[model samples]
Target: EETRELQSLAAAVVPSAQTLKITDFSFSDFELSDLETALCTIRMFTDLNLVQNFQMKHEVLCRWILSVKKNYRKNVAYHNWRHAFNTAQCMFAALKAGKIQNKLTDLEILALLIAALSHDLDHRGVNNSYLAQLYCHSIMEHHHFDQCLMILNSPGNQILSGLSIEEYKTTLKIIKQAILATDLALYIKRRGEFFELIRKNQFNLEDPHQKELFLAMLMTACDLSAITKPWPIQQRIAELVATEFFDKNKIPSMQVGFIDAICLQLYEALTHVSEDCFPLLDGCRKNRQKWQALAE
Candidate 1:
């Protein structure tokens, strides 16, 4: 019965997933239904050749994705599956449109997409501060990564089942690191090192440590990519994020600070690595101008 259900779900999305461009920055998950969101995720895997490269069986991959979606609490306002889906879309755009894929290994690309999609799994619409009583350090991020591993290893959802033992270990390690990078605390602690590397033209994608920094920065960039979206999209996302935070009047000014303190320098440094990333940098700057005007 489980196998049959998974097959039907995969079959249902296969047609629509085929037509999805997956790499378009203009792609929005706002209006997509749950099934369509899953389809888009499957498309991302296929588009990146992740399924092919990792030898993931199509049905198993579909089951894994559907399971991942199920693990995300639908009642949450902002950090629900849609947010995860949009984050993954931004990662897809960054890899394909921004040309970041050229520098990543197949395994790295696979892990990043997984991490982006599953990074906030099981979020309860509460910040880490609220969860600190439970786990103290990066509590929510740790839970999300644990939830991700549970799904990956569960029966019939073993998407990584095709990987060699060493490959599996490395992939899980990358996925954990990428998920943990979504914590702004970690990003703040490490972003200066990434910026320094870029400043000195010393950022080597081949070096293990340098690559870790690059991936961490890349994860942060994609996690915050909602701010780099088109204006209407950005406005709606702001509303959604504010909804979750119970905020209203001070949004514009708050956004200005967010861009200044976080988005601007990160995207700027990314552009220094790949000119194709200028669109993200450009979008963020344009949004900052809009927010600045509103602040005035």
Candidate 2:
């Protein structure tokens, strides 16, 4: 019922003649409406050939995208639909402009994009610590992944239905890992091993474990890509995140700390693996200076 309504709404707004103009890494969602965001999401899938590659039906994809969008809690300041859209855009940019797609399989690309777009579904504007005290470990991340699965299985939202059984299983596993990897705790725990692999020149895409670790780091990169945007964009995002946490006064210091502790090392290691990732590293460094100046 709800899925049917959203699918109809999606079909009505997403005209056949419309095309997405902003297809690059600089894509912004600050001005887009919910319907426009849905349109852009569809355009991304079409442009990436995920629709063609996976034999996904256009209407079903629209339904799934709309359902995913609807599942996000609009009241949250940062982890809402726009954040999810931006994350997906970052992944798209990395794949296309950054040329990271050259190293990833089509199915891997498909799963990563889906994971990026749906990572924080139903997020409740609270950190993992709050959830941890309320429940068990990684409760928020687990809920987010479960929400992703629920939407994928819902009526009119079976975007992965066209995949073969083996492909479907593999894709879901990748999606689960990618989504769970968004938990910053997990990133902090696993990133050292990934960085060590790069440092020791032991990283090989052919190795399944190494590839999964790389994919997990890639997910974090996209999740935090806001830090790599221009200063104004980064500042605005910082404000939003700070506001969400009720720490607006601590924005500068917090951002500087976040960059030094998380963004810099991750982007640096990624750039070492693929120079095409230099833009991310470069932007991260530039933002670090900006935050540092403000902090001082």
Candidate 3:
């Protein structure tokens, strides 16, 4: 069920993020648009948008996002391929806006791009509430969602697994680290560095340095930052994700009572304040300055 949806969804969303690539994303020379989309989709899913920045590192991320789909992720709401598709589209939109406004560095934009696109790879359709309820924390041997990212980082699961253990290990180190940063439980600890570096008061870099990092943070901000977006987009994605949770966890969590209610409360709190994504990005003007200037 989810396999087909993921395959189709992944195929469609890749082009939306084509701009995220560094002008030269390799794809084995396939003629099929579906194939191109699939290849790029995988790269997006693994947050490998900035593959050009690093040599083999791009390959690793590409391999992981593409490959992980066959292993996990649902076809519907949250972890659904559609959800991943939405993330890819949003990442590209953010990057495009940043690029136009001269507010983001190439690298920072890539990071935000990749980060947003691949933040939710290999999902099991259940929210953290389910993970917490099922004691998946202990079962998975980690505190929360971030640790689950170990699935991608695991020795066997790394996208670069085909390469020599040494090379593969290094590549996995980079991509996996980016994936685990999504555990909203620790958003503060992970994102604190970002808030510190963006320099809400300065724009010293020439071409907007650290664009890759910005891409990572941008997606992170976008995914969890949904609450801050326009009410319609936010509410739709929000409720749809909630429904996906309910549908995906049909058997176990459905039987549990408070589990669903907890999820509801979480959304309530989110909607109470979310108006638009990071007010700073709203004033960005195109064909003028680099997106990074917003940092200044």
Task: Compare the candidates by lDDT and give the number of the best one.
Answer: 1
lDDT tens digits by residue: candidate 3, 63-99 = 4455544443545466644444445544554334323
TM-score per model over all chains? 0.93, 0.91, 0.46
Residue 156 lDDT (model 1): 77
- Sorted on lDDT, highest at the top, how do the candidates line up? 1, 2, 3
Q: What are the RMSDs of all candidates, in order?
A: 2.2, 2.7, 11.8
lDDT of each: 0.86, 0.84, 0.41
Ranking by TM-score: 1, 2, 3
Error of 3 at 128 (Å): 6.8
Q: Identify the runs in model 3 with alpha carbons over 4 angstroms from their true place.
A: 1-66, 100-118, 127-170, 190-216, 225-232, 244-296
User: Which pairs clash inside model 1?
Assistant: none
Prediction 1 TM-score vs. true: 0.93
Between candidates 1 and 3, the TM-score winner: 1
Model 1 per-residue lDDT tens digits across residues 122-157: 888854244325544677788899999999988878
Give, for candidate 3, the lowest lDDT window spanning 10 residues: 283-292
